[PDB]
Amino acid sequence: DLKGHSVREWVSMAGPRLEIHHRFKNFLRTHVDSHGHNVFKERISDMCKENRESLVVNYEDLAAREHVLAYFLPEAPAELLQIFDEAALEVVLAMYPKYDRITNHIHVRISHLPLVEELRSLRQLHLNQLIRTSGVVTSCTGVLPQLSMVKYNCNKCNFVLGPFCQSQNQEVKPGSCPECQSAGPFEVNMEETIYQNYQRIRIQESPGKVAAGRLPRSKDAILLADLVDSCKPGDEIELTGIYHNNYDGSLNTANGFPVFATVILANHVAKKDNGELTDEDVKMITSLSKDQQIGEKIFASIAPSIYGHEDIKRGLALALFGGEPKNPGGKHKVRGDINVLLCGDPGTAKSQFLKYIEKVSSRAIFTTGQGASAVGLTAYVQRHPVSREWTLEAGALVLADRGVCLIDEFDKMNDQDRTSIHEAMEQQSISISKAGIVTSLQARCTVIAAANPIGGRYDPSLTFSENVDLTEPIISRFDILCVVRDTVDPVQDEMLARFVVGSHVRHHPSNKGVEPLPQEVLKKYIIYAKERVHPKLNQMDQDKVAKMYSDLRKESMATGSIPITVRHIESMIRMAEAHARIHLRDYVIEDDVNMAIRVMLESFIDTQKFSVMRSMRKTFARYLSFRRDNNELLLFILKQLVAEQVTYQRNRFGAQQDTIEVPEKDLVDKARQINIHNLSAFYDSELFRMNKFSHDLKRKMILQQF
Amino acid sequence: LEEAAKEVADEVTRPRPSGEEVLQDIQVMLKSDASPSSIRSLKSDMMSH
Amino acid sequence: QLYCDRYLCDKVVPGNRVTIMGIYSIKKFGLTTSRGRDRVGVGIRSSYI
Amino acid sequence: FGGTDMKKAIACLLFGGSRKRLPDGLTRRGDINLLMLGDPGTAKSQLLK
Amino acid sequence: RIQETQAELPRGSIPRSLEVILRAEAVESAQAGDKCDFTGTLIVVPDVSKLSTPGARAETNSRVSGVDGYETEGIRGLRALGVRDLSYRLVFLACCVAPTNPRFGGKELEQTAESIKNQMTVKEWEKVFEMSQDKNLYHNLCTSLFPTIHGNDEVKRGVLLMLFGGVPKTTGEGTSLRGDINVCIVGDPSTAKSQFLKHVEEFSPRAVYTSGKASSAAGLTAAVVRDEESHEFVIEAGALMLADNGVCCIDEFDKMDVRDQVAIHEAMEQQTISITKAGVKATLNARTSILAAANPISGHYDRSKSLKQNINLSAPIMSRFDLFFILVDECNEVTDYAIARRIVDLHSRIEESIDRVYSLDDIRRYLLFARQFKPKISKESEDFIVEQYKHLRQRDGSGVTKSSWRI
Amino acid sequence: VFGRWDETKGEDNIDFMPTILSRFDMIFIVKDEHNEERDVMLAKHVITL
Ligand SMILES: Nc1ncnc2c1ncn2[C@@H]1O[C@H](COP(=O)(O)OP(=O)(O)OP(=O)(O)O)[C@@H](O)[C@H]1O
Ligand SMILES: Nc1ncnc2c1ncn2[C@@H]1O[C@H](COP(=O)(O)OP(=O)(O)O)[C@@H](O)[C@H]1O
Ligand SMILES: Nc1ncnc2c1ncn2[C@@H]1O[C@H](COP(=O)(O)OP(=O)(O)O)[C@@H](O)[C@H]1O
Ligand SMILES: [Mg+2]
Ligand SMILES: [Mg+2]
Ligand SMILES: [Mg+2]
C-alpha cells in the first residue's frame, strides 16, 4: 500500500520497492491511450529503432493511471526513478530481447510535471525533490566523459579492481585490493572503465520573467549521457530535475558561513522553440517556382514589417540568393557574393532591414560598427571570459563564412575594423599573426552594411562617396549601393504612419502589406532560399552587354562622373545569376540579364551627383525602366510635378494649400516624352487611387486631397 | 607494434657501426585514409579508442 | 588538449589545420581531486588525445 | 585582359635578380619591387592576388 | 550587503557597509538599491584574517608539556595546545526586513493595478481616485513636482510624461518596442537642468543620479564578483540596473566618455545589459527612462545652428531621445525679475513658500498605481495620430525656416 | 591622389615622397580614359565567367 513513515525510507524497503516496480511495469504495459493505442509500445519501438535509450513518460497519464506512484515520485525522485528505469529496461528486454547489448539502461524522463517552481523561489524545502523550472541556458561545458562503471588497477599487483558504480555525489574510492590486500594506490583502468556523457549547464531566469527591481538568479544543472547537447546557450528550456544538495558543496573550509551549493540533476529538458531538412518539400518549391511571377512574390516577401523600400527589398533578395563564385584555373578568383550597402539618412529602417536579414537567413551574424555587439569584426586570441578556455576568436567575418555579415553603423568602424573588413571583402579570408598563430582562416560572406551619411543627411548634390565616411576601396567592394532618402511626401507619410501605428495597435500586450503580389510565408521562403543546392550557369548574350558598357563608358567619361568599370559588369553578372536562381532556372535568360542591368544601373546612377544623375536617368532610361510598368512611371512623373507645384506654392504662400492640383496637359506632355500616350488606365489604376489622387475630367484637372 | 618495429629495425640494420651498438626504440606514427570525425562526436563511448 | 611525443613534437605550429589520430584518453595522476571554489562535478577527469 | 608589359615585369619580379654580398660585407639586393599606380577598375588587386 | 545611508555620513567619511544575514522567510526581502529597515541582532562571526600581528588567541587551560622529541614548540606545539586566533567581524542577523519609507501603508507582498489598489489603505485610495478624477491634474502635478522652479513649463511637462512612460510592446517577429520616453535638457549655464535632474532623483523611487566623468562602464551598467560562500557569481547592479523601471539621471551627459556612451546607448536600444565577465555570462534587464542634461558646445547654445551643431552627442545617442529641451538664457529683464523673486522667496521662507497641491507621497502612490495601466489606441486616436504626424512632417519641408532638428 | 589619373595634373597625381619612388625598380601608370573599341574586354569578362 502506502503510508509508512518516510516516503524515501518507505520506498527503499524491499516490499514497497518491488511493489512499485510491478506497478510501473503494469502501467507501462497497460496504459493504452485515450483512444486505445498503447503509446508505450510504439514509443519503445521508436526508441529501440534508433538506439535511443531514453523513454519519455508523461506525468499527466501516470497520475491518471497510477496516482500513488505520481504522488511518491516528486518526494523521492532518485529511488522512484531508479525503479522506473529498471522496470522499463526489463519491459524493453521483453519487447526486444536482442536490445540488451545496447546500453543496458533505459532512462525514464518525465514530462509535464505539474507544478513549476521558478529559479528564484527554490528553497531548501525543495531539496531532493523533482522540480520543473524554466530559464535560459547561459553557459554549457563541452561533453565530458564521466566515470560510470569504473575499474581500477592495483599498481602493486596490477589486478583490475572490479567495476564500481560512480554515484553523482561521492568519489568512489576502493578499499583494499581483493588480491594483494593493499590499501595502497589505485588508478583508473581507462580501457575497462565505461564512461557516460556529462555536461554542466547554467540556467538563469528569463529576463522578461524577472520582476521590476530584482536580478535574475541562476542555477547549475547536470546533463547525463542522453541529455547532453540538448541545450545551447541562449536556449529557453523547461528543465525537470532533482534539486540536489549533497555531493561536496558545503562551505566547510572556513571561508565563512556553512552554506550548501546546490545543483539540479536534470531529468528532462524541453526546449521551447519551433532548422532545414528540405525533404519532400521540394515539389512545392518547384510548384511555386512555376509561378512566372515568383520573382515579384519573393521581392515582396522580404522584410514584411518594413513599409515601402521596394528597391532595397529587391536588392536584398538578390543578395540573399547571390551569384556564382568562380575561379578560372586556380589563379583568378571572383566572388559570387552580392554585397549591399545601405546609406541613408536616419529613421529609414536600415537597422530593421539588417535585423530582418539576420532572422531570415542561416549563418547570419549581426555586428555593429560601434562596440555594441557580441562579436566584433577582427580576429583575436584570448582566454574566453566565461569558458576560461584559450580560444581563437575568429571575428564576425569568418563566423559567417558561407552566410551573411550584417554590419550596422558601418561608417563608425575603427581603423582596425576597417582593415579587417577590407581584407575580408577583398581577399575573402582573414590573416592572423597574433600570438604564435600564423593562419589564414577564410571568410566568404556576403556583407550587408548600413551607414549613415556624413552630417546626418544625404546630399544629392554630392556623389555617394563624398557624403559617406567610407573610402573608395570599401565602397567599390559593394555590388549594390542603396541611397536611402528621407523626404517629406504627405501620401507616403500617411501610409507609413498608418503602417506603424497599426503595428503598435495590434501588438498591445493585452491581445497576445500593399503589393500586387501575395507575400510568401517566411518558412517556405527560408526553405526556398535554402534551395541553393543547385548551382547555375550562363551562356547568353554578350553584344548587348558589351554595347551597354561601351555606352556607359562614353557617357560617364563625357560627363565628369564616377566611371563605370569592369567590376560593374561583373556585379551585373552576379545579379543576373541571382535572379536566375530566384526562378530556379539553371540558365540566365534575357530577362535575368535585363533585370540585372536595371539593378546595376540604378545602383550606379543614384550614386552620382544630381546633375549627372539626371543626365544618366535620361540617356539610359530604356535600360532603366525594364519591368517598370507604365502605371508606376506615370505615378513618378505625377509626384514630381505635384511636388514642384507644392514647393512653388509654399515658397511665397507660407504653407502648402489645400486641394493641390495640376493640369491634364503637362502630365500628357511628359507621358509623351516617355512615349505613353494612353493615360486612361493610369486614371483607372488602383495605384492612382491609392495615392489619394483624383481625375477631374470636367476641367482636365487632377489633384490630391493632402 | 613498436616493439615489433624495434626488432625489425634491429635485424635490418644488423650489424651497426661501433658507437651505434645499442639498439634504439622506434616510434610508430600511424596514419589512415579514413575521413576524420567531428570533435563534437568525441562522446564517452570513444574513450580509449 | 593534445599530447604529442618523441617525433610528433614540433611537427606542427599554432595556426596549422591538422588531422590528428590518437587515443581519446584521460589524465591518470592518482584520483586526488580536492579543488576549491568550482568543480561541483564528481567522477570527471581531464580528457586529451 | 591586356597588361602584357606589366605581366612581363611581374614575371621578372617573380624570378628576381641576384643578391650579392661584396667582400667588404655590403650587400646588394636581388629582389625587384614594382609599383602599380592606376585607375580603380584595372585588375591590379587581381594581379597582386 | 547594505551600506550607510547618505544622511548618516559624518564629515570626510566613506559610507560604512555591513553584511546582513537574512533567514528562512526574510530571505528575498531586500533588493539592490532598496532603502530598507533591518530588525535583528548584531552578531560576531569568526573571520579568518591576520598578519596585522599575532593577536588574541585561545588555547587549552590544561597544562601539558611535550616530552623530548615531542616538545610542544612550533607548529606541533600550537596544534597540541589547540591554539587558534580569536578574530571576529561584525555582521547583522536580520529577523525582519521592511522598507524604510513604505509606499502604501497597508501591506506589501505580481503587481497588477488591483494588487496595487488593494495594497493601499482606504484614505490612500481615496486620494488616488480623487486626483485621477482631477481635471487640471496635469498642471497640478507639474506645479507640485517642481515648486521652486520658475517657468520652463514644457520641461516640467516632458519630465512628468517621462515619469509616467508609455507602453512596452513585443512584435510577433520578436521586435521589442520601447515604451518609455527619454528626455535630454540642453541649455545655457544656470538654467536649472541639474535642478530638474535632482528633483526627479529625490522624488522618484528607483531613480539614480550620475554625472559625466565620475562613472565607469562597470559602475554604470554591471559588474561581476564571485560569491564568497559558494560556486556561483553575484552580479553587482550599476546605475542603469538600479534605475530599472525608474529613471537614470545623467548630468553632464556631454562630458561622458565614449566607452561609457556606448553602454548608455546599448541600454537605450534594447533595454538590456548583456555581461560576459569573470566566468559568468548573464543578460541583465534595464527598462530605464533616461533624463539627461547636456551643456552646449562652448557652453552657450547658438540659436543660429542646428541641435547637432550645438551638442557633441553622437547621432546614435541623439536619435533615441524622445524630447529635447533647449533652455536658452534669454536676457529678459522681466524674467530676470521673476526668477529673482522666486529664488529670494525660496531662500526667505524655506519650509514654507512651497504650496504644492499634492504631497510627494501622494504622487508616488498615484504613479505606482497609474503605471499599471496599459492604455489602448482607439481607431480615432490612430487617425488623429496620423494627421498630427503628417503636420509634423510638413513642418520639415522647404520654403519655411529650418527647424533645429529634422522630423 | 584624387582617384583617377588625369593628365591635366601630371606629376601631381602621386603623393609618394621621392625616397619611396626610388625604392621601386619599375613604376607602372595605368589609365582608362578613352577607347570605344575596348569592348572585347567586356566580351572577355563574359567569356571568362
Ligand atoms: N518603411 C519604413 N520606413 C522607415 N521607418 C520605418 C518603416 N517601417 C517601420 N519603421 C520604423 O522606423 C524606426 C527606425 O528605426 P531603425 O533603427 O530601423 O532606423 P535606422 O535606419 O537604423 O536609423 P539610424 O540611421 O538613425 O540608425 C523603426 O523603429 C521602425 O519601426
Ligand atoms: N583586363 C581587365 N581590366 C580591368 N579589370 C579587370 C580585367 N580583367 C578582369 N577584371 C576585373 O575587374 C574587377 C575589379 O578589379 P580589381 O582587382 O578590384 O582592381 P583594382 O583593385 O585596381 O580596382 C576584378 O574582378 C577583376 O577580375
Ligand atoms: N526658473 C529658473 N531658471 C533658471 N535658474 C533657476 C530657475 N529657478 C531656480 N534657478 C536656480 O539656478 C541655479 C542654477 O541651477 P543649476 O541647475 O545648478 O545650473 P545648470 O542648469 O547649469 O546645471 C539653481 O540653484 C536654481 O535654483
Ligand atoms: Mg540604425
Ligand atoms: Mg584594389
Ligand atoms: Mg549642471
Ligand SMILES: [Zn+2]
Ligand atoms: Zn593488488
